[PDB]
Design a protein around this ligand. Structure first.
Ligand code: CLA
Ligand code: CLA
Ligand code: CLA
Ligand code: CLA
Ligand code: CLA
Ligand code: CLA
Ligand code: CLA
Ligand SMILES: CCCCCCCCCCCCCCCC(=O)OC[C@H](COP(=O)(O)OC[C@@H](O)CO)OC(=O)CCCCCCCCCCCCCCC
Ligand SMILES: CC(/C=C/C=C(C)/C=C/[C@@]12O[C@]1(C)C[C@@H](O)CC2(C)C)=C\C=C\C=C(C)\C=C\C=C(C)\C=C\[C@@]12O[C@]1(C)C[C@@H](O)CC2(C)C
Ligand SMILES: CC1=C(/C=C/C(C)=C/C=C/C(C)=C/C=C/C=C(C)/C=C/C=C(C)/C=C/C2=C(C)CCCC2(C)C)C(C)(C)CCC1
Ligand SMILES: CC1=C(C/C=C(\C)CCC[C@H](C)CCC[C@H](C)CCCC(C)C)C(=O)c2ccccc2C1=O
Ligand code: SF4
Ligand code: SF4
Lengths: 165, 107, 107, 226, 73, 73, 80, 209, 64, 41
């Protein structure tokens, strides 16, 4: 009960939205025989809607004055109250993959720039080495940290093209 | 013309959400996006974008992720082609979505 | 006059089940707009078996056309004087292509 | 030197071919140990993780074994925290956490300054005069009062045999504690009870039959049963 | 109130655009690098690529995720 | 929705700041054209050479930034 | 008209005078390059500013520079 | 120089006849690189051996069902087997996955590095678990050991690859005429020998409209 | 004789050049006493598309 | 095969193989699992 938001389990507007969705989904059920493939698809859609409405509730989710679930973004407020699962862990979940992509791209860039006429490697990819780096990028933050520490991550400006202002 | 054709109609495209024609509203707004995104390639030139690319190349040079192929801005003819293609695609898909949603939700 | 045409069926993967609209006849899907049902009613077509046969024949002719392009370029390429026979091309595409197709469709 | 291989026929890394280490099996496909000081820091981290894994897994197992034997009523580890929190003569959770963090920060700063500058904790007159024995023999092997029974000041053969044994039981304990966490997460019971279920009924009690470990397997089994 | 807010906001935006334009005019017309060597101005001009690149990064990140969440919703 | 449109506002401010700052810092020199200070503040281009130099002046940077300012306001 | 200036970085490839369809540029003897040639612009008032010489210039940066401003009846390319 | 898949055709350059069953049939130019050639040879041999094993098991079960033993059809045999199996589904497939992961990673690293598994790393076995050829191991896999004689070994290689290719065709025929007839392969064989002039692939209703 | 060794990598310190703070390979050094006798070749083209440029003696140094 | 696998390592290995893999992957997470909002494991 933070930011004036009621929990999804104890929200009247959430249940109103749920029963409105159930009503509009059951409206289309009356135009098909129960032993039909469109009827089976509509029943599967209704089951998925009910499962989504059940799982969104009692999962540390809040909604306020609209029946639509809200997300808590400030860490700490997502820690003492059970709201870390909204954005706290998935932030690191995205960042792990983003650093993975950046690290394997950097590894391919260095390992291609040390090859004769290296401009063709960007249009003519090599698959074994790119896949080898693709399955070696799980420990991307450790490699990035050690490369920053030893100085091979960055390059001396002396060797960087600089605008002549 | 405006009020009685583009406003008297297109009331079903905006109200298509939650129905079978919601994809027409999605196509309508994506077409608005693509039509609006084209004007970047149409009003602008190449020197500003080349200098911005130079700054980004410096940024990628600082931590040694410089591509072997040098990043360059699109050519002036290339930029005009991209602008006109995105403009035509956005306008055609806008009219397509509006026409189809109006003629299916009513006719 | 009461069942809307439909020829594209989307998957139930993510929220697309709302796009399978109730077009009538115990069927759900995208209400098509190309008028293919009208064309398949003009040319006498009753069952989906004939549409299947037409699709298989079209795939066979597409493979034949691709093989024809490969042969007529890589294998047996015509010379410049073959393409410069404008009178023969006009006669064969006036009497042959257009006229023979019109006669075949009339039959 | 090079003892065994984690994968026979695999191309061992160049920094592991002629490297004198405890429990070196060539297992570095990601080449995180190519840099030497990197390898030193990772060796120290593996040593501390492994040693606290010995302590943790022993706390899992020996009270659990004695509970299975009925000697003591000590509960399983996953509810033992709530048991002590709800106890009568209990230090509060905040006080315990802060005391643990303070003491561990002190000792880990000691170990850290040992790591960065070797033998730097032997600065005279710095820790009540007892710091003269705080010199580190090797990375992660301090000695001094950390070996009060004198089991390390012998010939190097039993010394690095014991180092290999320590790293082997430590890797085993680390995978064992990962297992304890996972098999509480899936089965919801203690590891001794899980071992009893696997010994008494191996086929019907496994990671595959539990739907948490591999989702969708239960649906496959139900569809195949019908 | 709506007209007043809209008027003064558009006026403020145009005036800030003019501020940056006339700052650019200062940089090209009457900026003397030997007059102020090593000061805040010359140092800002020295790593101008870093400032431009970081502004491009924050703008790209904001636009990417704002449009992503808007299109998602 | 208020927070999302606030982030859109921040995006507009950030992008307008990015283009105006880049035009101001590259007003006198650039890697595409080091001698931009000799061509005046408001000049059309340098020609089709060197890939193409349309809208290379800081005046055109302001001119493109007015669109972003209008969109932001 | 416009101002056309040639700097000492020119190496006498004598292709900037071919790319100019107005006979603005000319090649004079020099001693600061291997080719012993230097671009000169005697008929500068006939230039329109088409920057074809800058396109044809191989040196980095450009040896021949054309500066716009002060348009006339010949610099605007007007046949009327 | 050798019998080819087409009389009077030109064999591929990479198919010189040194392999078992080298009839020079390769219109798609696969296995042209030597590494890809070795990988294709290993894949053909493992698919072959699994094909002969599965077809032999299918034929044995169908023959036993024809005699009168309570043996299921080659199709849905596991569906009724799991109901009486002490091992439940899931545990069975994952036990198979673990064992096959061990075996197949061992044989894969023997393929990449010949003789790599004969170093005594696994239970101190040196001569065994060491490969003899491209896809042909030795030692523990050759108990009776009639591959010592080179001529007999080559003849057995040709016999193995030919019966294996026949086993691929047998499995494809099994699934095809099971979908056609919904009967056992021995049932189809007995129907073909009972009424050859009428019962065939054309008078089964399906697959010939 | 008066410049760097032919084939040796040098660093260009010319500010207005495209290859400022970049590394190029010397292909020839003129000995006739011209304004820019050092001729170098760069692996990356400029915006004009060329890869070679001429610099003076003071505009080239050995990269570290 | 050498000439063909040299072509197949160009644009479709990164423009099609990655695209199809990442797409169909994400499709199957969104299919087998329903639509999530909170990471509650
Ligand atoms: C409403 C139309 C529109 C849109 C969407 C954009 C979007 C953008 N412009 Mg802008 N621009 C426009 C009109 C528009 N412009 C007009 C009319 C002008 C006047 C000429 C300008 C002038 C202008 C300048 C001068 C500058 C920009 C910049 C930018 C970028 C800002 C960075 C950002 O916000 O994150 C990104 C914002 C997005 C909206 C992301 C769009 C991409 C999405 C994710 C789709 C990607 C493809 C998708 C996955 C589908 C793939 C298949 C498909 C490609 C076929 C962004 C790409 C700046 C820039 O690029 O530097 C960083 C910059 O300097 N623009
Ligand atoms: C982007 C900046 C930002 C902002 C505006 C907030 C805002 C807030 N945080 Mg958060 N926080 C942030 C970033 C931010 N956080 C980050 C990056 C972390 C690290 C993970 C935290 C960790 C954190 C904790 C651990 C806690 C907060 C709490 C709070 C709340 C009260 C803080 C207070 O009164 O200060 C007082 C400052 C005195 C000097 C408030 C909603 C507290 C909370 O839940 O409030 C009820 C709380 O316990 N924050
Ligand atoms: C993997 C290679 C790689 C790496 C490590 C970086 C890293 C960086 N870029 Mg760059 N970028 C790349 C590729 C890369 N970029 C490509 C291909 C493009 C063209 C679309 C750009 C366009 C670009 C712009 C326009 C900007 C950056 C910026 C940045 C910085 C911000 C981080 C970020 O996420 O930016 C965001 C990056 C993107 C939006 C690009 C995404 C494109 C994909 C993900 C890259 C695909 C590469 C591929 C997977 C590698 C091959 C793998 C290998 C195994 C074969 C950072 C220095 C910003 C900056 O200057 O900040 C300091 C900035 O404004 N980049
Ligand atoms: C009566 C004979 C005849 C017929 C029917 C055609 C028909 C055609 N020709 Mg023409 N052509 C002919 C004689 C003929 N040609 C002669 C004698 C010459 C040389 C002077 C040419 C030179 C020529 C050129 C240079 C080109 C054509 C092209 C075309 C196609 C135009 C595309 C179109 O309208 O869509 C109609 C499409 C269809 C009806 C789809 C079915 C197509 C079928 C498979 C073609 C069958 C017709 C063919 C003549 C049968 C004999 C071929 C035999 C060896 C198998 C069309 C298929 C264009 C092309 O390349 O397309 C192939 C083209 O650029 N023609
Ligand atoms: C987190 C604990 C941990 C740490 C710090 C190390 C560190 C080390 N071990 Mg060890 N190892 C561990 C756990 C760990 N291991 C476990 C649990 C096992 C059994 C499965 C092994 C089995 C093992 C063998 C067989 C060998 C090593 C070796 C090594 C060295 C390789 C250095 C390296 O790649 O970077 C250090 C690696 C990390 C910091 C890991 C980063 C964390 C990842 C990204 C998450 C993994 C999560 C997991 C998959 C679940 C280094 C001394 C080799 C050696 O002696 O070389 C000197 C060697 O031969 N270890
Ligand atoms: C009080 C603030 C202030 C001051 C003192 C100046 C003063 C100056 N600026 Mg600055 N400027 C300002 C605000 C200011 N400007 C603002 C707000 C903007 C953003 C719009 C600019 C943008 C700007 C640029 C980009 C440039 C200048 C330039 C100049 C110089 C000459 C401009 C001039 O008078 O041309 C007189 C101009 C006109 C008579 C044209 C008027 C047409 C207007 C602008 C269009 C209005 C639209 C429409 C037609 C209005 C009528 C609507 C209709 C329905 C009735 C002078 C140093 C120029 C300079 O220094 O030269 C290199 C230059 O390049 N300024
Ligand atoms: C790249 C994303 C991705 C991922 C992760 C999967 C993964 C899977 N698919 Mg899928 N599939 C994909 C792309 C993907 N596919 C594409 C691109 C298509 C269209 C051609 C399909 C079409 C498809 C069908 C038609 C079926 C699957 C099925 C399956 C499952 C059984 C396969 C298996 O045991 O593999 C190992 C899996 C380990 C988790 C598996 C979870 C089957 C299924 O539903 O499962 C029974 C099934 O019937 N897939
Ligand atoms: C493995 C899946 C298939 C990969 C095919 C392509 C392989 C490269 C193709 C290639 O060139 O192979 C050649 C070479 C062979 O490796 P080695 O013979 O040294 O053996 C090490 C591994 O390959 C064993 O799998 O590969 C590598 O060096 C890359 C290894 C990447 C790491 C793989 C094993 C470790 C995986 C760890 C996963 C969990 C990590 C968690 C933390 C991030
Ligand atoms: C036919 C086949 C492959 C055919 C491939 C062909 C023609 C390829 C042709 C070409 O490549 C060449 C040569 C050369 C190239 O230049 C050109 C092309 C054209 C590309 C594989 C079958 C392969 C078939 C195999 C491996 C069969 C395995 C069977 C098993 C394991 C059985 C197990 C069972 O489970 C069942 C199914 C049911 C249970 O009741 C019983 C048990 C026993 C439990
Ligand atoms: C009191 C208070 C507070 C605080 C506040 C603050 C601290 C603020 C700040 C603010 C700020 C801090 C702002 C700023 C702004 C800025 C701007 C807006 C800028 C602009 C710029 C420009 C425009 C530029 C220009 C130029 C150029 C371009 C070049 C050179 C020249 C010149 C400089 C001219 C608080 C919150 C705590 C609370 C409440 C109360
Ligand atoms: C924006 C712009 C540019 C810059 C645009 C460039 C350099 C082209 C960028 C193309 C991108 C790299 C294509 C790929 C886009 C995304 C990376 C695709 C994402 C796909 C997802 C699945 C990740 C110009 O070069 C230009 C030139 C002349 C007139 C106007 C303009 C102009 O307006
Ligand atoms: S184009 Fe440039 S470098 Fe070439 S001769 Fe003319 S002024 Fe000299
Ligand atoms: S701008 Fe054109 S007309 Fe003028 S000197 Fe150059 S090439 Fe000749």
């Amino acid at each position: 009960d933070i930011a004036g938001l009621t929990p999804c389990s104890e929200s009247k507007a959430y249940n109103k939205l749920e029963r409105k969705e159930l009503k509009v989904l059951d409206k289309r059920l009356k135009k098909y025989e129960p032993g039909s493939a469109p009827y089976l698809a509509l029943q599967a859609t209704k089951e998925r809607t009910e499962n989504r409405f059940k799982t969104y509730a009692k999962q540390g989710l809040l909604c306020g004055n609209d029946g639509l679930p809200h997300l808590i973004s400030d860490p700490g407020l997502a820690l003492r109250f059970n709201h870390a699962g909204e954005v706290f862990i998935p932030t690191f979940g995205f960042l792990y993959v983003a650093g993975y992509i950046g690290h394997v791209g950097r590894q391919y860039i260095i390992l291609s720039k040390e090859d004769a006429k290296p401009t063709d490697k960007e249009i003519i990819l090599d698959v074994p080495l790119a896949l080898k780096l693709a399955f070696q990028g799980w420990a991307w933050p450790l490699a990035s940290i050690q490369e920053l520490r030893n100085g091979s991550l960055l390059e001396k400006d002396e060797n960087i093209t600089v605008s002549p202002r | 013309w405006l009020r009685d054709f583009l406003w008297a109609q297109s009331s079903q495209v905006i109200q298509s959400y939650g129905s079978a024609l919601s994809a027409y509203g999605l196509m309508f707004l994506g077409a608005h996006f693509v039509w609006a995104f084209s004007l970047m390639f149409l009003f602008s030139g190449r020197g500003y974008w080349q200098e911005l690319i130079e700054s980004i190349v410096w940024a990628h040079n600082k931590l040694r992720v410089a591509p072997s192929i040098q990043p360059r801005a699109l050519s002036i003819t290339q930029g005009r082609a991209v602008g006109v293609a995105h403009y035509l695609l956005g306008g055609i898909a806008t009219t397509w979505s509006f026409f189809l949603a109006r003629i299916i939700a009513v006719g | 006059t009461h069942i809307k045409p439909s020829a594209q069926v989307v998957w139930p993967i993510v929220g697309q089940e709302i796009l399978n609209g109730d077009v009538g006849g115990g069927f759900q899907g995208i209400q098509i707009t190309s008028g293919f049902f009208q064309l398949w009613r003009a040319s006498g077509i009753t069952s989906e078996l004939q549409l299947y046969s037409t699709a298989i024949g079209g795939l066979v002719l597409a493979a034949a056309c691709f093989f024809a392009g490969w042969f007529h370029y890589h294998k047996a390429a015509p010379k410049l004087e073959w393409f410069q026979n404008v009178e023969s091309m006009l006669n064969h595409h006036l009497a042959g292509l257009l006229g023979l197709g019109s006669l075949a469709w009339a039959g | 030197s090079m003892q065994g291989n984690w994968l026979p026929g695999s191309q061992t890394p160049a920094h592991l071919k002629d490297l004198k280490m405890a429990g070196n099996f060539g297992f570095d496909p990601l080449n995180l140990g190519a840099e030497p000081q990197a390898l030193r820091w990772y060796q120290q981290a593996e040593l501390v993780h492994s040693r606290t894994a010995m302590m943790g897994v022993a706390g899992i197992l020996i009270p659990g074994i004695f509970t299975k034997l009925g000697a003591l009523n000590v509960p399983q580890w996953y509810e033992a925290g709530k048991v002590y929190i709800e106890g009568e003569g209990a230090i509060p959770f905040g006080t315990l956490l802060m005391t643990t963090l303070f003491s561990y920060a002190f000792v880990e700063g000691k170990r850290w300054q040992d790591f960065r500058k070797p033998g730097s904790q032997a600065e005279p007159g710095t820790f009540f005069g007892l710091e003269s024995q705080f010199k580190g023999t090797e990375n992660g092997y301090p000695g001094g009062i950390f070996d009060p029974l004198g089991y390390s000041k012998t010939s190097p053969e039993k010394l690095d045999e014991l180092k290999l044994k320590e790293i082997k039981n430590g890797r085993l304990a680390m995978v064992a504690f990962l297992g304890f966490a996972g098999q509480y997460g899936a089965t919801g019971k203690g590891p001794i009870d899980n071992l009893a279920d696997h010994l008494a009924d191996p086929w019907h009690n496994t990671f595959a039959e539990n739907g948490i470990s591999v989702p969708g397997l239960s649906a496959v089994e139900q569809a195949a049963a019908n | 109130q709506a007209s007043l807010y809209t008027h003064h906001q558009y006026i403020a935006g145009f005036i800030m655009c003019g501020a940056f334009a006339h700052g650019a005019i200062f940089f090209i017309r009457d900026y003397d690098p030997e007059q102020n060597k090593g000061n805040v101005l010359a140092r800002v001009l020295d790593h101008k690529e870093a400032i431009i690149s970081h502004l491009s990064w924050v703008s790209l990140f904001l636009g990417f995720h704002t449009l992503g969440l808007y299109v998602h919703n | 929705g208020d927070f999302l449109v606030h982030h859109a506002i921040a995006l507009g401010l950030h992008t307008t700041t990015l283009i105006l700052v880049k035009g101001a810092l590259d007003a006198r020199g650039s890697k595409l054209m080091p001698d931009k200070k000799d061509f005046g503040y408001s000049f059309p281009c340098d020609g089709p050479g060197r890939g193409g130099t349309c809208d290379i002046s800081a005046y055109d940077a302001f001119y493109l930034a007015v669109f972003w300012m209008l969109n932001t306001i | 008209a416009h101002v056309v200036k040639i700097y000492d970085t020119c190496i006498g490839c004598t292709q900037c005078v071919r790319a100019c369809p107005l006979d603005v540029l000319e090649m004079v003897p020099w001693d600061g390059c291997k080719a012993a040639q230097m671009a000169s612009s005697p008929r500068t008032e006939d230039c329109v500013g088409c920057k074809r010489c800058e396109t044809a210039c191989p040196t980095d940066f450009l040896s021949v520079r054309v500066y716009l401003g002060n348009e006339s009846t010949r610099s605007l390319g007007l046949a009327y | 120089d050798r019998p080819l898949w087409s009389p009077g055709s030109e064999p591929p350059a990479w198919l010189d006849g040194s392999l078992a069953g080298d009839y020079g049939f390769d219109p798609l130019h696969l296995s042209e690189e030597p590494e890809m050639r070795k990988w294709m040879v290993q894949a053909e041999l493992v698919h072959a051996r699994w094909a002969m094993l599965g077809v032999a098991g299918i034929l044995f079960t169908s023959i036993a069902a024809k005699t009168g033993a309570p043996f299921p059809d080659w199709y849905d045999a596991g569906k009724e087997a799991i109901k009486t199996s002490p091992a439940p589904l899931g545990s069975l497939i994952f036990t198979e996955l673990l064992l096959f992961g061990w075996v197949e990673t061992k044989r894969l690293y023997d393929l990449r590095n010949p003789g790599s598994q004969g170093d005594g790393s696994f239970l101190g076995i040196t001569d065994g678990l060491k490969g003899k050829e491209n896809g042909y191991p030795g030692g523990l896999f050759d108990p009776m050991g009639m591959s010592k004689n080179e001529a007999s070994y080559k003849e057995a290689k040709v016999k193995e690859i030919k019966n294996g290719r026949l086993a691929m065709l047998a499995f494809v025929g099994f699934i095809a005429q099971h979908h056609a007839t919904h009967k056992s392969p021995i049932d189809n064989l007995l129907d073909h020998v009972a009424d050859p002039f009428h019962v065939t692939f054309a008078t089964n209703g399906v697959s010939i409209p | 004789e008066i410049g760097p060794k032919r084939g040796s990598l040098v660093k260009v310190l010319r500010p207005e050049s495209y290859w400022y703070n970049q590394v190029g390979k010397v292909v020839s050094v003129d000995q006739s006493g011209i304004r820019y006798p050092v001729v170098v070749r760069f692996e990356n083209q400029n915006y004009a598309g060329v890869s070679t440029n001429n610099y003076a003696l003071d505009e080239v140094t050995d990269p570290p | 095969m050498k000439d063909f696998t040299t072509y197949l390592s160009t644009a479709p290995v990164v423009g099609l193989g990655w695209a199809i893999f990442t797409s169909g992957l994400l499709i199957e997470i969104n299919r087998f699992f329903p639509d999530p909002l909170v990471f509650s494991f």
